[PDB]
Design a protein around this nucleic acid. Structure first.
Lengths: 34, 154, 115, 56
RNA sequence: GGUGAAAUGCGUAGAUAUAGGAAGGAACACCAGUGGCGAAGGCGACCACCUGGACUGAUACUGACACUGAGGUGCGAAAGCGUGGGGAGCAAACAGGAUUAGAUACCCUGGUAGUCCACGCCGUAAACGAUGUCGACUAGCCGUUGGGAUCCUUGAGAUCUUAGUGGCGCAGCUAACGCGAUAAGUCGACCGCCUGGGGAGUACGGCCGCAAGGUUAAAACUCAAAUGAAUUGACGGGGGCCCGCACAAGCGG
């Protein structure tokens, strides 16, 4: 939640994997879809 | 960890012809000899009904009517405190303590004759005012905090 | 008195669970907390004790009527959804739950992160 | 075309049920029009044509 | 009935608390985006006013007016520092309460400086892309932001073109990792800098500061090394799979 203060260095660490799990989603599944 | 265990009890006799007391010769032949145990093994069957009016099995069949707990207490942990899981199990599981617990707690009485000692509380399985029907309802009582321990974190 | 409908709060913190029954005139009738049922210490900030705490709100509210109730939930802790099923079971045919959890739009800064 | 705080039939299509603006990954909207959407929301929201929170 | 577990504020003063009101600071959820703007530091509500630079399209004009830059001079997170407002929340110091051989701490309950505003100072950061600025060139593919133009055109769109911002990757380079039109390639112009590790960004001097201190900046002496990146192993109070009476069924000191 908003329980503790997130110091804005560790809050400016974003994008867990969203250019992998939503960008390489149509790449790594191309071993079958060709 | 697949279970390759296979259960199959033999239930037939040339003397009693019972179900869960036919193949029981295991704890009544107390590591020694059958000659001395033969009068103690099936000598108590006609000693529990020889003091009452009904047949031996009459009060032997009603042992799983007041000595079988409705829950289980096997522990498990997830990331905090160990929580057990209690729920309606299969008959076999529930009806295992409804004889052997009533049977093994007869050494703290011990009256005349070894066979009477074994038959000491076999006739108690009807009214359930002995010691085997004192821990039956006790099990249920220790499940208020364990009531919601089955799905979430269990 | 006898009031037939009221709005019923659940304060659902990480530590405790407070349930207060009011009317739509907001005035408190019967409050029952998750530590007021003899808990006192460590263990049950759990949906178990709110199941215990929400019913005591019920059978003390069953003095001045209160058939239908409206449930306001406020807080992040367990005992959030196991106090609204512990509430219809006391003979309430509650209309709809409502969530009122206070969210700042930027607000005060929170405390330091626990280490 | 150029969406506007008066046009509430357009603005209500990107307001969620709790009052919040819906992102661009949910509705298919271009990045220029989204940041133009969330200004006409915030003007109609200010001007009491739209709530901030769900409640009232 | 917080949690690796309990201890402070409450009832002849009403206890977390109402469907209520008022005050006051401070931060602007959602939008929010390998998004945007800025020389960097930075900048997130909305509206108005005052203002800077970019991007972009054609056309007209000036005609090398350019690039860089020792000195110098501006602007520089935070915290600190005067001087005066302010003071919710949070909170160095500090008080207790725990936890532990101790605990001077990590956890709890408080809480003044500070954080906030005005003017002035400091002038530093892992101030980082650990990568100076400017210019020209060198395979592609996949996103995205601001424009523009072409495309049968409905755009649900497509293509090329620019200026940014990203993900891969050919050549090439690299000690390797890796970089690869946002070069660490290929070259050019200029500047800053480095010369084994400690001593040491330290003494002494000078300059600056109100201070804290900053900046410029060594030697004696000491040691044969420090150091980078990758490799095999061992190890981890790293993670994921797997096994065995390892975990509890009807044993017994």
């Amino acid at each position: 939640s908003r329980e503790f203060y997130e110091k804005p260095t560790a809050e400016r660490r974003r994008k867990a994997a969203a250019a992998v799990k939503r960008h390489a989603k149509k790449v790594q599944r191309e071993q079958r879809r060709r | 960890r697949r279970r390759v265990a296979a259960k199959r009890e033999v239930l037939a006799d040339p003397k009693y012809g019972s179900q869960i007391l036919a193949k029981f010769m295991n704890h009544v032949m107390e590591s020694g000899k059958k000659a001395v145990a033969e009068r103690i093994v099936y000598g108590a069957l006609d000693k529990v009904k020889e003091r009452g009016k009904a047949d031996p099995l009459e009060t032997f069949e009603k042992a799983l009517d007041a000595i079988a707990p409705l829950v289980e207490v096997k522990s498990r942990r997830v990331g905090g405190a160990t929580y057990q899981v209690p729920v309606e199990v299969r008959p076999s599981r529930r009806n295992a303590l409804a004889m052997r617990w009533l049977v093994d707690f007869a050494r703290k009485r011990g009256e005349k004759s070894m066979a009477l000692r074994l038959a000491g509380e076999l006739l108690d399985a009807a009214e359930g005012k002995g010691a085997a029907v004192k821990k039956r309802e006790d099990v249920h009582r220790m499940a208020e905090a364990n009531k919601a321990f089955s799905h979430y974190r269990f | 008195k006898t009031v037939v409908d009221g709005i019923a709060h659940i304060h659902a913190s990480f530590n405790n669970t407070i349930v207060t029954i009011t009317d739509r005139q907001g005035n408190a009738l019967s409050w029952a907390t998750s530590g007021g049922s003899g808990f006192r210490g460590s263990r049950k900030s759990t949906p178990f004790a709110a199941q215990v705490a929400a019913e005591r709100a019920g059978q003390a509210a069953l003095e001045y009527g209160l058939k239908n109730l409206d449930v306001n939930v406020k807080g992040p802790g367990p005992g959030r959804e196991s106090a609204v099923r512990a509430l219809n079971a006391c003979g309430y045919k509650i209309a709809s739950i409502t969530d009122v959890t206070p969210i700042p739009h930027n607000g005060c800064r929170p405390p330091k992160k626990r280490r | 075309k150029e969406i506007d705080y008066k046009d509430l039939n357009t603005l209500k299509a990107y307001v969620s049920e709790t009052g919040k603006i819906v992102p661009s990954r949910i509705t298919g909207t271009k990045a220029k029009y989204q940041r133009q959407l969330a200004t006409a929301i915030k003007r109609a929201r200010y001007l009491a044509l739209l709530p901030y929170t769900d409640s009232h």
